[PDB]
CSV table of C-alpha atoms and ligand atoms in Angstrom, one decimal:
chain,number,residue,atom,x,y,z
A,1,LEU,CA,0.0,0.0,0.0
A,2,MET,CA,0.7,3.7,-0.4
A,3,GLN,CA,3.1,5.4,2.1
A,4,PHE,CA,3.5,9.2,1.6
A,5,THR,CA,7.3,10.1,1.6
A,6,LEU,CA,9.0,13.5,1.8
A,7,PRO,CA,12.2,14.7,0.3
A,8,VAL,CA,15.2,14.0,2.6
A,9,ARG,CA,15.6,17.4,4.2
A,10,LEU,CA,11.8,17.4,5.2
A,11,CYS,CA,11.8,13.7,6.1
A,12,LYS,CA,14.5,14.5,8.8
A,13,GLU,CA,13.5,18.1,9.8
A,14,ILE,CA,9.7,17.3,10.1
A,15,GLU,CA,10.5,15.3,13.3
A,16,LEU,CA,12.0,18.4,15.0
A,17,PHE,CA,9.8,20.8,17.0
A,18,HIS,CA,11.2,23.9,15.2
A,19,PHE,CA,10.3,22.7,11.6
A,20,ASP,CA,8.7,25.3,9.3
A,21,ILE,CA,6.3,23.7,6.8
A,22,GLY,CA,7.6,26.0,4.0
A,23,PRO,CA,6.1,28.3,1.4
A,24,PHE,CA,4.7,25.6,-1.0
A,25,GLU,CA,1.0,25.5,0.0
A,26,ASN,CA,0.5,22.5,-2.3
A,27,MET,CA,2.9,20.3,-0.2
A,28,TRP,CA,0.9,21.0,3.1
A,29,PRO,CA,-1.8,18.3,2.6
A,30,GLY,CA,0.9,15.7,1.9
A,31,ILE,CA,2.9,16.8,5.0
A,32,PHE,CA,-0.3,16.4,7.2
A,33,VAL,CA,-1.1,12.9,5.7
A,34,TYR,CA,2.6,12.0,6.3
A,35,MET,CA,2.1,13.0,10.0
A,36,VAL,CA,-1.1,11.1,10.4
A,37,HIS,CA,0.4,8.0,8.9
A,38,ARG,CA,3.5,8.1,11.3
A,39,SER,CA,1.7,9.3,14.5
A,40,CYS,CA,-1.5,7.3,14.1
A,41,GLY,CA,-0.9,4.6,11.3
A,42,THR,CA,-1.7,4.1,7.6
A,43,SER,CA,-4.9,2.2,9.0
A,44,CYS,CA,-6.2,5.3,11.0
A,45,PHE,CA,-8.2,6.8,8.1
A,46,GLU,CA,-9.3,5.8,4.6
A,47,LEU,CA,-6.9,7.8,2.4
A,48,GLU,CA,-9.7,9.0,0.0
A,49,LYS,CA,-12.0,10.2,2.9
A,50,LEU,CA,-8.9,11.8,4.6
A,51,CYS,CA,-7.8,13.7,1.4
A,52,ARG,CA,-11.3,14.9,0.8
A,53,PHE,CA,-11.6,16.0,4.5
A,54,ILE,CA,-8.2,17.9,4.3
A,55,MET,CA,-9.3,19.7,1.1
A,56,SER,CA,-12.7,20.8,2.6
A,57,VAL,CA,-10.9,21.9,5.7
A,58,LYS,CA,-8.5,24.0,3.6
A,59,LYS,CA,-11.4,25.6,1.6
A,60,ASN,CA,-12.9,26.7,4.9
A,61,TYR,CA,-9.8,28.7,6.1
A,62,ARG,CA,-9.9,32.3,4.9
A,63,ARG,CA,-7.1,34.3,3.2
A,64,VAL,CA,-6.3,36.4,6.4
A,65,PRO,CA,-2.7,37.3,7.4
A,66,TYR,CA,-2.2,34.8,10.3
A,67,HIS,CA,-5.3,32.6,11.1
A,68,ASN,CA,-5.1,30.8,7.8
A,69,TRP,CA,-4.5,27.3,6.4
A,70,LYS,CA,-0.7,27.6,7.0
A,71,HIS,CA,-1.4,28.2,10.8
A,72,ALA,CA,-3.6,25.1,10.9
A,73,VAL,CA,-1.0,22.8,9.4
A,74,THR,CA,1.8,24.5,11.6
A,75,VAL,CA,-0.2,23.8,14.8
A,76,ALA,CA,-0.8,20.2,13.6
A,77,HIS,CA,2.9,19.7,13.1
A,78,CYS,CA,3.8,20.9,16.6
A,79,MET,CA,1.1,18.4,17.9
A,80,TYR,CA,2.8,15.7,15.7
A,81,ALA,CA,6.2,16.5,17.4
A,82,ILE,CA,4.6,16.3,20.9
A,83,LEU,CA,2.9,13.0,20.1
A,84,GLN,CA,6.0,11.4,18.5
A,85,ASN,CA,8.3,12.5,21.5
A,86,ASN,CA,5.7,10.9,24.0
A,87,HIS,CA,4.9,7.6,22.1
A,88,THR,CA,3.3,5.6,24.9
A,89,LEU,CA,1.5,8.4,26.9
A,90,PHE,CA,-1.5,8.7,24.5
A,91,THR,CA,-4.5,6.6,23.6
A,92,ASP,CA,-5.2,5.5,20.0
A,93,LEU,CA,-8.3,7.8,19.9
A,94,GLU,CA,-6.2,10.8,21.2
A,95,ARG,CA,-3.7,10.2,18.4
A,96,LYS,CA,-6.7,10.2,15.9
A,97,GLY,CA,-8.4,13.2,17.4
A,98,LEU,CA,-5.6,15.6,18.2
A,99,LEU,CA,-4.1,16.1,14.7
A,100,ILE,CA,-7.6,16.5,13.4
A,101,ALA,CA,-8.4,19.0,16.2
A,102,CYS,CA,-5.2,21.0,15.4
A,103,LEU,CA,-6.0,21.1,11.6
A,104,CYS,CA,-9.6,22.2,12.4
A,105,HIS,CA,-8.9,24.5,15.5
A,106,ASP,CA,-9.3,27.9,13.7
A,107,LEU,CA,-11.7,26.8,10.8
A,108,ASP,CA,-13.4,29.9,9.3
A,109,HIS,CA,-11.5,32.4,11.4
A,110,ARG,CA,-12.1,35.9,10.2
A,111,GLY,CA,-8.9,37.6,11.7
A,112,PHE,CA,-10.8,39.1,14.7
A,113,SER,CA,-10.8,38.3,18.4
A,114,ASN,CA,-13.8,37.1,20.5
A,115,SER,CA,-13.7,40.6,22.0
A,116,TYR,CA,-14.1,42.3,18.6
A,117,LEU,CA,-17.1,40.1,17.7
A,118,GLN,CA,-18.8,41.0,21.1
A,119,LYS,CA,-18.2,44.7,20.5
A,120,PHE,CA,-19.4,44.6,16.9
A,121,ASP,CA,-22.4,42.5,18.1
A,122,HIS,CA,-21.7,39.8,15.4
A,123,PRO,CA,-24.5,37.1,15.3
A,124,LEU,CA,-21.8,34.5,16.5
A,125,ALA,CA,-21.6,36.5,19.8
A,126,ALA,CA,-25.3,35.8,20.6
A,127,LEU,CA,-25.1,32.1,19.5
A,128,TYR,CA,-21.9,31.5,21.6
A,129,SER,CA,-21.5,33.9,24.6
A,130,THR,CA,-18.0,32.6,25.6
A,131,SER,CA,-15.2,31.1,23.6
A,132,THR,CA,-17.2,32.6,20.6
A,133,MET,CA,-14.8,31.8,17.7
A,134,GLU,CA,-13.8,28.4,19.3
A,135,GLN,CA,-17.4,27.1,19.5
A,136,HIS,CA,-17.7,28.2,15.8
A,137,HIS,CA,-14.5,26.3,14.9
A,138,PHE,CA,-15.8,23.1,16.5
A,139,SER,CA,-19.2,23.7,14.8
A,140,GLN,CA,-17.4,24.0,11.4
A,141,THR,CA,-15.5,20.8,12.2
A,142,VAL,CA,-18.7,18.8,12.8
A,143,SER,CA,-20.2,20.3,9.6
A,144,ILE,CA,-17.3,19.2,7.4
A,145,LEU,CA,-17.3,15.7,9.1
A,146,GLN,CA,-21.0,15.3,8.0
A,147,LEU,CA,-20.5,16.2,4.3
A,148,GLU,CA,-20.9,13.1,2.1
A,149,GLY,CA,-17.7,11.1,1.8
A,150,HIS,CA,-16.0,13.1,4.7
A,151,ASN,CA,-16.6,10.8,7.7
A,152,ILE,CA,-13.0,9.9,8.4
A,153,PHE,CA,-14.2,8.3,11.7
A,154,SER,CA,-16.8,6.0,10.1
A,155,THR,CA,-14.9,2.8,11.2
A,156,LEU,CA,-15.3,3.8,15.0
A,157,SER,CA,-18.2,2.5,17.2
A,158,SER,CA,-20.9,5.0,18.2
A,159,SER,CA,-19.2,5.4,21.6
A,160,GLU,CA,-15.6,5.7,20.2
A,161,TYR,CA,-16.9,8.3,17.7
A,162,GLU,CA,-18.6,10.2,20.6
A,163,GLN,CA,-15.3,10.1,22.6
A,164,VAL,CA,-13.2,11.3,19.6
A,165,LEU,CA,-15.6,14.2,18.9
A,166,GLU,CA,-15.4,15.1,22.6
A,167,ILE,CA,-11.5,15.0,22.6
A,168,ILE,CA,-11.8,17.4,19.5
A,169,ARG,CA,-14.4,19.7,21.1
A,170,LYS,CA,-12.4,20.1,24.3
A,171,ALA,CA,-9.0,20.5,22.4
A,172,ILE,CA,-10.5,23.2,20.2
A,173,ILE,CA,-12.3,25.1,23.1
A,174,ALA,CA,-8.9,25.0,25.0
A,175,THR,CA,-7.3,27.2,22.3
A,176,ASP,CA,-9.3,30.1,23.7
A,177,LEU,CA,-6.3,31.7,25.4
A,178,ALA,CA,-8.7,33.3,28.1
A,179,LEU,CA,-9.0,29.7,29.4
A,180,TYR,CA,-5.3,28.9,29.4
A,181,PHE,CA,-4.2,31.1,32.4
A,182,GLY,CA,-6.4,29.1,34.8
A,183,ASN,CA,-5.8,25.7,33.1
A,184,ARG,CA,-2.0,26.3,33.5
A,185,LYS,CA,-2.3,27.4,37.2
A,186,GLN,CA,-4.4,24.3,38.0
A,187,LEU,CA,-1.8,22.1,36.3
A,188,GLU,CA,1.2,23.9,38.0
A,189,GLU,CA,-0.5,23.1,41.4
A,190,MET,CA,-1.4,19.5,40.6
A,191,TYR,CA,2.1,18.8,39.3
A,192,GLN,CA,3.8,20.5,42.5
A,193,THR,CA,1.5,19.0,45.2
A,194,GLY,CA,2.0,15.7,43.2
A,195,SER,CA,-1.9,15.1,42.7
A,196,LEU,CA,-1.4,15.2,38.9
A,197,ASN,CA,-2.8,11.9,37.6
A,198,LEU,CA,-2.9,10.8,33.9
A,199,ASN,CA,-5.5,8.1,34.6
A,200,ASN,CA,-7.9,10.9,35.8
A,201,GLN,CA,-9.8,11.9,32.7
A,202,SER,CA,-10.4,15.6,33.9
A,203,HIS,CA,-6.5,15.7,34.3
A,204,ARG,CA,-5.8,14.4,30.8
A,205,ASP,CA,-8.2,16.9,29.5
A,206,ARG,CA,-6.2,19.7,31.2
A,207,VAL,CA,-2.9,18.3,29.9
A,208,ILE,CA,-4.3,18.1,26.3
A,209,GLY,CA,-5.6,21.7,26.8
A,210,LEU,CA,-2.1,22.9,27.6
A,211,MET,CA,-0.7,20.9,24.6
A,212,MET,CA,-3.2,22.8,22.5
A,213,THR,CA,-2.1,26.2,23.8
A,214,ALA,CA,1.6,25.1,23.3
A,215,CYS,CA,0.9,24.0,19.6
A,216,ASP,CA,-1.2,27.1,19.0
A,217,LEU,CA,1.6,29.5,20.2
A,218,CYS,CA,4.4,27.4,18.5
A,219,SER,CA,5.3,30.6,16.4
A,220,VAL,CA,7.5,31.5,19.3
A,221,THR,CA,9.4,28.1,19.2
A,222,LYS,CA,10.8,28.5,15.7
A,223,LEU,CA,14.1,29.7,14.4
A,224,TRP,CA,14.4,33.4,14.9
A,225,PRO,CA,13.9,34.5,11.2
A,226,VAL,CA,10.6,32.4,11.2
A,227,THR,CA,9.4,33.8,14.6
A,228,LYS,CA,10.2,37.3,13.6
A,229,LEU,CA,8.4,37.2,10.2
A,230,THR,CA,5.5,35.3,11.7
A,231,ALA,CA,5.1,38.2,14.3
A,232,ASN,CA,4.5,40.6,11.3
A,233,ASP,CA,1.5,38.5,10.2
A,234,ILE,CA,0.2,38.3,13.8
A,235,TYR,CA,0.3,42.1,14.1
A,236,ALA,CA,-1.1,42.6,10.6
A,237,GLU,CA,-4.3,41.0,12.0
A,238,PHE,CA,-4.2,42.8,15.4
A,239,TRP,CA,-3.8,46.1,13.8
A,240,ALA,CA,-6.7,45.6,11.3
A,241,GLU,CA,-8.8,44.7,14.4
A,242,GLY,CA,-7.6,47.9,16.0
A,243,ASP,CA,-8.7,49.9,13.0
A,244,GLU,CA,-12.1,48.2,13.3
A,245,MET,CA,-12.2,49.1,17.0
A,246,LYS,CA,-11.5,52.8,16.1
A,247,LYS,CA,-14.4,52.6,13.5
A,248,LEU,CA,-16.8,51.5,16.3
A,249,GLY,CA,-15.5,54.6,18.4
A,250,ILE,CA,-13.4,52.3,20.7
A,251,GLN,CA,-9.7,52.9,21.6
A,252,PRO,CA,-8.2,49.4,20.9
A,253,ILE,CA,-5.8,47.9,23.5
A,254,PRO,CA,-2.0,48.7,22.8
A,255,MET,CA,-1.5,45.2,21.2
A,256,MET,CA,-4.0,46.2,18.4
A,257,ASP,CA,-3.0,49.9,17.9
A,258,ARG,CA,-0.7,50.3,14.8
A,259,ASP,CA,0.3,53.7,16.3
A,260,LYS,CA,2.3,51.6,18.9
A,261,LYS,CA,4.3,49.8,16.1
A,262,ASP,CA,7.5,51.1,17.8
A,263,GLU,CA,6.8,49.3,21.1
A,264,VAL,CA,6.5,45.8,19.5
A,265,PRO,CA,9.7,44.5,20.9
A,266,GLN,CA,8.6,45.4,24.5
A,267,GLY,CA,5.0,44.0,23.8
A,268,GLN,CA,6.7,40.6,22.7
A,269,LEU,CA,8.8,40.6,26.0
A,270,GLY,CA,5.6,40.9,28.1
A,271,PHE,CA,3.9,38.2,26.0
A,272,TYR,CA,6.9,35.8,26.3
A,273,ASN,CA,7.1,36.4,30.1
A,274,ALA,CA,3.3,36.3,30.8
A,275,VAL,CA,2.2,33.6,28.4
A,276,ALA,CA,4.7,31.7,26.3
A,277,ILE,CA,7.5,30.8,28.9
A,278,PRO,CA,4.9,29.8,31.6
A,279,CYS,CA,3.2,27.6,28.9
A,280,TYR,CA,6.3,25.7,27.8
A,281,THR,CA,7.7,25.5,31.4
A,282,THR,CA,4.5,23.8,32.8
A,283,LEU,CA,4.3,21.6,29.6
A,284,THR,CA,8.0,20.5,30.0
A,285,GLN,CA,7.3,19.6,33.8
A,286,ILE,CA,4.4,17.4,32.7
A,287,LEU,CA,6.0,16.1,29.5
A,288,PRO,CA,9.8,16.2,29.8
A,289,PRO,CA,10.5,15.4,26.1
A,290,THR,CA,8.8,18.7,25.0
A,291,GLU,CA,11.8,20.6,26.5
A,292,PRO,CA,13.1,21.8,23.1
A,293,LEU,CA,9.9,24.0,22.8
A,294,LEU,CA,10.9,25.8,26.1
A,295,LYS,CA,14.5,26.1,25.0
A,296,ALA,CA,13.5,27.6,21.6
A,297,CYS,CA,11.0,30.0,23.3
A,298,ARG,CA,13.8,31.2,25.7
A,299,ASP,CA,16.1,31.6,22.6
A,300,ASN,CA,13.5,33.8,20.9
A,301,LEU,CA,12.8,35.9,24.1
A,302,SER,CA,16.6,36.6,24.2
A,303,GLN,CA,16.4,37.6,20.5
A,304,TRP,CA,13.6,40.2,21.4
A,305,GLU,CA,15.8,41.4,24.3
A,306,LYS,CA,18.6,42.0,21.7
A,307,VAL,CA,16.2,43.9,19.5
A,308,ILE,CA,15.4,46.2,22.5
A,309,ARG,CA,19.2,46.7,23.3
A,310,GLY,CA,19.7,47.9,19.6
A,311,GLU,CA,22.0,44.8,19.0
A,312,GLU,CA,19.3,43.9,16.3
B,401,J2L,C1,2.6,33.2,18.8
B,401,J2L,C2,2.1,34.5,19.3
B,401,J2L,N1,0.8,34.6,19.9
B,401,J2L,C3,0.7,35.9,20.2
B,401,J2L,C4,-0.4,36.6,20.8
B,401,J2L,S1,-1.8,35.7,21.2
B,401,J2L,C5,-1.6,34.0,22.0
B,401,J2L,O1,-2.7,36.5,22.1
B,401,J2L,O2,-2.4,35.1,20.0
B,401,J2L,C6,-0.2,37.9,21.1
B,401,J2L,C7,1.0,38.7,20.8
B,401,J2L,C8,1.0,40.1,21.1
B,401,J2L,C9,1.6,40.4,22.5
B,401,J2L,C10,1.6,41.9,22.7
B,401,J2L,N2,2.1,42.8,21.9
B,401,J2L,C11,1.9,44.0,22.5
B,401,J2L,N3,2.2,45.3,22.0
B,401,J2L,C12,2.4,45.5,20.7
B,401,J2L,C13,3.0,46.9,20.8
B,401,J2L,C14,2.2,47.6,21.9
B,401,J2L,C15,1.9,46.5,22.8
B,401,J2L,N4,1.3,43.8,23.7
B,401,J2L,N5,1.2,42.5,23.8
B,401,J2L,C16,0.6,41.8,24.9
B,401,J2L,N6,2.1,38.0,20.2
B,401,J2L,N7,1.9,36.6,19.9
B,401,J2L,C17,2.7,35.7,19.4
B,401,J2L,C18,4.1,36.0,18.9
B,402,MG,MG1,-8.1,30.3,17.6
B,403,ZN,ZN1,-4.8,29.0,16.3
């Protein structure tokens, strides 16, 4: 049967946490199938249903600067690297669910925060009062799973299907960063008082939530030139949202005000110190073989410090 294979440099570097999937959009589906096949098996999904699923998922990501199809596949590769470094820790259903959740986690993102949708009074803000975009992404995921010929989970029992859709729902909701701060504190406490227990389902759920935040933020774990150019896309969105806040008669927060372009380096410091480093530190305590993500994060913080010192 039909293995996907990658050129040599990608075959070796895809295994590393800091891999960048590259600028050739047409290779991203093959990269994803490659990662399914190694992390899950050639048996996990029917190739034709999987291919069809991946292509409808792509079609439902919008042409926005950051929250686009490249982000989806990027977050899926970080999950691949976590799963492959922690072979025996995860169930077969988790292996199945988590790469799908990662590919799907920002489906139909419009380039605006939950907060902007609430202030604009978008219909989605009435349908979903918290984690607005994330409930939308999970909804789009179910929609695409229900298209004819798209049920990649059709070989699972009813109860196994319900479990996988529940891993996916929780993994996608956990990407709402408003939820991360508390998830991470609870995990920091359970790990330190030694109550953390991977047989407890509500504990796995938290650990998979943190994994989701870690994959989602994985821009900060790349080689410096990747990190730095990705920040440009991240701000291109924030600043467009800022413009849209000013159109509603609202001062955006500094993060979203393009008049604060000059403070970016200091904004990245606060973000590495308040969000990124805590994220990868707690993740490395729970899952020691994820340490290269923390190391890469720390290398990038120290590059932002250099930019501030005028050394860059
Ligand atoms: C992967 C990645 N995720 C993010 C996010 S997130 C997870 O919210 O999506 C936010 C940020 C912006 C952080 C920030 N910038 C500023 N300023 C800009 C100039 C004035 C103030 N303040 N703050 C807090 N960066 N980022 C990165 C590199
Ligand atoms: Mg999101
Ligand atoms: Zn995302």
